[PDB]
Point group: C2
Chain length 163, copies 2
């Protein structure tokens, strides 16, 4: 069920460092991303997929800071989402949902990262200074269990026929 | 395998079967998917205003139409209005929209994300504070027209490995 996939997908903050992601799994994740809807079908994104062992280490280190994202250096894959000139931001959320749901459907863990050293990750991967790097999605096999979800109550987030 | 088949079958449906209602249990599964979306800091900066009343749906759908776009919205029996509840909020709302439309497709329902609409009229019809930003209406209902193949950029334009 789709709902079981939604429930099992979580932010994994620990990865098996020595354990590679298979090329066919990653390709299906990026296909899900590419096939995302977008306003005007503008598809205003580029996914820079870091799979090189040494590069991924460096990208994951540049995602860490201020006590956050220490686990990022352990994920063997980092999908960097660059805005390709409002709706772009909505569109990139769409694509992130498709990446992380696809990762979970493939037995892989993921974590969307909005906090990182944008400058350094852009230098490491040759992204122009003038392009906005918006998210890094870490991908790898998880080592910790499924935590229980915390969400706001229905009444705070959902009303019928009425604000 | 299955997930990718779902991603390919989900599409923007631009015609609805006007007399066929959406089962409440299907709607509830879609809203559960939306609620369970991830968000930066788990802030969940959204409220879903779910229009199921036949007359109100008609009016919200009509207020989505203009410049010859979105004329089919008035035929959708359900409208999920996504209101921002204080960057990340916009990314978060796109996450939630993906969850809603994938969930709709998994239930055998059609959907269309609408970013263009008469925001003031829809707010006035539904009670949404003037000062709160209504960002999307997702129309939900049973489709009339068939599945199309996707038009997307080539892999090479949107995907590069290890370097931009
Ligand atoms: C943020 C957003 C806003 C959209 N607004 C509209 C709209 O107002 N009217 C419309 O007909 N389609 C709307 N679309 C649908 C897009 O045209 C559609 O997703 C895109 O063409 C890709 O086609 P597909 O959804 O059928 O794969 C919107 C999509 C997104 C993501
Ligand atoms: C836009 C965005 C950015 C995120 N940034 C981070 C981040 O930098 N570090 C982190 O540990 N989690 C990050 N997360 C994950 C959220 O904390 C997480 O999705 C939320 O707490 C709900 O938990 P769940 O994803 O396990 O269901 C981010 C999520 C989103 C949507
Ligand atoms: Cl559009
Ligand atoms: Cl967070």
């Amino acid at each position: 069920d789709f709902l079981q996939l939604v429930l099992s997908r979580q932010s994994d903050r620990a990865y098996d460092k020595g354990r590679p992601v298979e090329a066919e799994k990653l390709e299906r994740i990026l296909e899900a991303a590419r096939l995302s809807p977008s306003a005007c079908n503008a598809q205003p994104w580029k996914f820079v997929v870091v799979t090189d062992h040494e590069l991924a280490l460096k990208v994951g280190r540049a995602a860490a800071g201020l006590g956050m994202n220490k686990f990022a250096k352990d994920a063997p894959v980092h999908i960097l989402i660059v805005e390709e000139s409002h709706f772009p931001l909505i569109d990139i959320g769409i694509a992130a949902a498709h990446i992380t749901l696809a990762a979970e459907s493939e037995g892989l863990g993921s974590c969307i990262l909005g906090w990182f050293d944008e400058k350094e990750i852009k230098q490491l991967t040759g992204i122009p200074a003038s392009k906005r790097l918006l998210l890094d999605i870490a991908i790898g096999y998880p080592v910790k269990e499924k935590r229980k979800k915390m969400r706001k109550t229905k009444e705070k987030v959902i009303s019928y026929n009425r604000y």
